[PDB]
Design an enzyme around this catalytic site. Sequence first.
Site, PDB file in Angstrom:
ATOM      1  CG  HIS A 113      -0.379   2.503  11.368  1.00  0.00           C
ATOM      2  ND1 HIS A 113      -1.549   3.201  11.172  1.00  0.00           N
ATOM      3  CD2 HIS A 113      -0.008   2.040  10.166  1.00  0.00           C
ATOM      4  CE1 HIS A 113      -1.869   3.136   9.892  1.00  0.00           C
ATOM      5  NE2 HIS A 113      -0.948   2.450   9.255  1.00  0.00           N
ATOM      6  CD  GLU A 114       3.333   4.490  10.105  1.00  0.00           C
ATOM      7  OE1 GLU A 114       3.351   3.675   9.070  1.00  0.00           O
ATOM      8  OE2 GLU A 114       2.684   5.677  10.095  1.00  0.00           O
ATOM      9  CG  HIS A 117       2.641   0.203   7.144  1.00  0.00           C
ATOM     10  ND1 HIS A 117       1.790   0.249   6.026  1.00  0.00           N
ATOM     11  CD2 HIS A 117       2.085   1.152   7.880  1.00  0.00           C
ATOM     12  CE1 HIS A 117       0.821   1.078   6.173  1.00  0.00           C
ATOM     13  NE2 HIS A 117       1.014   1.765   7.229  1.00  0.00           N
ATOM     14  CG  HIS A 123      -2.888   2.563   5.097  1.00  0.00           C
ATOM     15  ND1 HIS A 123      -2.460   3.399   4.142  1.00  0.00           N
ATOM     16  CD2 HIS A 123      -1.999   2.693   6.102  1.00  0.00           C
ATOM     17  CE1 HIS A 123      -1.471   4.096   4.556  1.00  0.00           C
ATOM     18  NE2 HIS A 123      -1.247   3.743   5.781  1.00  0.00           N
TER      19      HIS A 123
HETATM   20 ZN   LIG Z   1       0.927   4.088   7.162  1.00  0.00          ZN
END
Ligand SMILES: [Zn+2]
Length: 365
Positions: A113-114, A117, A123
Site C-alpha cells: 500500500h505504501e 503512494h 488511495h
Molecule cells: Zn495511505
Amino acid sequence: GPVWRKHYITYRINNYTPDMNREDVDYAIRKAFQVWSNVTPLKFSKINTGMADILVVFARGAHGDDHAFDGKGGILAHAFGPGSGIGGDAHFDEDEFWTTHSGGTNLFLTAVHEIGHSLGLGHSSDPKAVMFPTYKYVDINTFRLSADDIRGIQSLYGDPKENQRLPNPDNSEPALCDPNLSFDAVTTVGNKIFFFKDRFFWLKVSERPKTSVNLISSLWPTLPSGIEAAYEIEARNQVFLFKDDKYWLISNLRPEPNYPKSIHSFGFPNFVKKIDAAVFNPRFYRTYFFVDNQYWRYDERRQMMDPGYPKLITKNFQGIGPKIDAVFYSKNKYYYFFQGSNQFEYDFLLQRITKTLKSNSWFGC
Ligand SMILES: [Zn+2]
Ligand SMILES: [Ca+2]
Ligand SMILES: [Ca+2]
Ligand SMILES: [Ca+2]
Ligand SMILES: [Ca+2]
Ligand SMILES: [Zn+2]
C-alpha cells in the site's frame, strides 16, 4: 500526482525494525515492490551502498519530516510521492509490531500500500483495494491487486511490454529491447532510420508506432550483410553503405551506375582500412568519417577532404569514447552517437553531450 521519469528505479532498506528477522523484511519488502512491477513496466533494485531512489525506513514519532508519527495505530506508514530527495521514500511507524503473519500489523500488506503512494497513487475509495486506507489484513501469497489499484498504476504507467496479462511480461531476443542492443551502423534515409546489425536492420521513428526488424538481403542488392558505417544525402536520394575497404551508393533503394568501389577515391590513406561510423551534415555540407581513433571530414560539394584531417575524436568531440559504433544527423543541429549500448544526444552547435540515452530509445521501448 506526478510520476517517475525512468523505466528502472532503486530502493535501499535503510534500517531494520528489531521486530526482526532481518531477512524476513528483505523479503516482505523485495516482494511488496514485486507486486507493482508485475502489472507495471518497472524494475526494482535493493542497493546496499550509495543513494537509492526509494527509501524504506523505520523511525518513530518525530523522525525528520515535518509530518510526525503517532504511536500505536493510526498512522503506520506514510511515503512520499516521486520527487528527488525524499521523493518516494516509504516510512514505517516503529511503535507497531510488524509481522510476516497477521498477528500484529502486517508489513507485507502495508509495505505494498505504501509503495504505491511512493509510486503515484492516492488511495482507492475501493474497499477491496490494498488500501481503502483501512488495511485488509488478508491471506498472503495468494493475494493480489484489486482491479481498481491496477487502473491507476496502469493509468500512470502501462501495461507491459509484449504480451497478455496478469499474468506479467516476457523478455525477447534478437530484440527491440535487449538493453545491450548495439549497432553495426545506422542512418536515416529521408525520414526513416535504418538500424543495422548483422543480417538485420530495424526501421523507423516516423509516426509509425513500432519497429519491425527485417533481413538486409531483402531490400538490398549488390550488398553484404554486416554493414559497418552509413549516411545519407536527402537531397539526391542517396544512402551510402560502407563495409571493409568498399562502399555502395544507393538511390531510391537502387544502386546507381557502378558499385562497390573503393573508399580511397574519396580519400584517405592506405593506412585506413575500414570506416566505422559516418554522418552527413546538411547545415554546412560535409560528411563525418570515423576511423577508430580519429575522424575525417569530406567536403561534399568539392569532393575533397577539408584541410587537416585525420583528427582526434575526443579532442574535437567532447567525451565521445575513442571508438564509435554509429552517428547520425538530427533534422536540426545534433548528431546522435551510438558507442556500445549507449548513445548520446550531441548538440554540435556548442559541442556537449546533452542527453545520454539508452542505445535503444527510438523503439521507445
Ligand atoms: Zn495511505
Ligand atoms: Ca528518494
Ligand atoms: Ca503509529
Ligand atoms: Ca515496534
Ligand atoms: Ca560500426
Ligand atoms: Zn517520515
